[PDB]
Amino acid sequence: DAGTVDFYGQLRTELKFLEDKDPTIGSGSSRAGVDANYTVNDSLALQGKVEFALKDSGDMYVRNHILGVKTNFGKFSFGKQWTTSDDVYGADYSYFFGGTGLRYGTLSDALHDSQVKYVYEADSFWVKAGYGFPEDNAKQELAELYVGATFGDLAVHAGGGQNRDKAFKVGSNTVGTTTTDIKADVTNSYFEVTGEYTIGDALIGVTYYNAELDVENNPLVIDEDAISVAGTYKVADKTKLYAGYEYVMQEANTGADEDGTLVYLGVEYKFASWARVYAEYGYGDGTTDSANNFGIGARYYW
Ligand SMILES: [Mg+2]
Numbered sequence: 001d002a003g004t005v006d007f008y009g010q011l012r013t014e015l016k017f018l019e020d021k022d023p024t025i026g027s028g029s030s031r032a033g034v035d036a037n038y039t040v041n042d043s044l045a046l047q048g049k050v051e052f053a054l055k056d057s058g059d060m061y062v063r064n065h066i067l068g069v070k071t072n073f074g075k076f077s078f079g080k081q082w083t084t085s086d087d088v089y090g091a092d093y094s095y096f097f098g099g100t101g102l103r104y105g106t107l108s109d110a111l112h113d114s115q116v117k118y119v120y121e122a123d124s125f126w127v128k129a130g131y132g133f134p135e136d137n138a139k140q141e142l143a144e145l146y147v148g149a150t151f152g153d154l155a156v157h158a159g160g161g162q163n164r165d166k167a168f169k170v171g172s173n174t175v176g177t178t179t180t181d182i183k184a185d186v187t188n189s190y191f192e193v194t195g196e197y198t199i200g201d202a203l204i205g206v207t208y209y210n211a212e213l214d215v216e217n218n219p220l221v222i223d224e225d226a227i228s229v230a231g232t233y234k235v236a237d238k239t240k241l242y243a244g245y246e247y248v249m250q251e252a253n254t255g256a257d258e259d260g261t262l263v264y265l266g267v268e269y270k271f272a273s274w275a276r277v278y279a280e281y282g283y284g285d286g287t288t289d290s291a292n293n294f295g296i297g298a299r300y301y302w
Helices: 083-086
Strands: 005-015 024-026 031-041 044-053 061-069 073-081 113-119 125-132 140-149 154-175 180-201 203-213 221-236 240-254 257-272 273-288 293-302
Touching: 024 240, 024 293, 031 061, 083 140, 083 180, 125 154, 180 257
Parallel strands: none
Antiparallel strands: 005 024, 005 031, 005 293, 031 044, 044 061, 061 073, 073 113, 113 125, 125 140, 140 154, 154 180, 180 203, 203 221, 221 240, 240 257, 257 273, 273 293
16 A cells, blocks of 8 residues: 545435425535545554535535544544534434434534544544634634443443534524624533444434533523434345434523424435435424424435
8 A cells, every 4th residue: 555545425316305395306415525545654644535515505615624644543633524523423323304312513513624533443442532623713612522332232432522602693683774693602512322232133222412502691501401212123135224213302591491302214225335225204393393204315425
């Protein structure tokens, strides 16, 4: 190996039916990119990776750009990246409607444009951490730390962190005729424990998430407790069924409570490593009704 250059990509096309909403067709979250890896010596490799996505607006942007340094002490990755909390993720096995019980992304949307992320893998035991450099009060603050381990057929992880947006859009303000965004200074603090159990052709995952949204210079404080119970079952050769139940409750320090349930059931056929097809129903519900959703998609990879 001198190093490799890998052009890669994913063509995604999806049809979505959201209850009491107009169906959509599209190719958002289609990706294309370049992953270059260069070996300097037997204890130091470099990575440059860039990934372009499609938006849904036809506009094409840089979804990720990464400089990686691989050493005998883990990888350090700098640049615009998904959060460590997003890499670690949790017991959401959906393609369309799940993941409501994973609370790390409320402000960050799983992205920070200027982080350093760290990864150390030992013998079925790992550590992942990340720091988002705040700048010009455009870049949010982020600090994250997760640990995981595998014990036979049981894989576990825990961790969390804290994410602050000093100018987060929470709504809109109209005085007389002029309209301006309402920004708040919000901190999301969160912690998570996940266990995933492999039992034959079945996988069962449970994730507990806790979070607190704390506004600065404003009394509001919202606590969130979330559980996700999900599973996949190999029914045929390249066919998994999957399903999940997600419950989150939010309790505001002002006494207002909200909660929401999301259930999903679907099927995945992995034709080959480069193509897959999937379909899924979602039943949503919560205090404020009974949304019924359906989605079907296909992916080509290169
Ligand atoms: Mg997906």
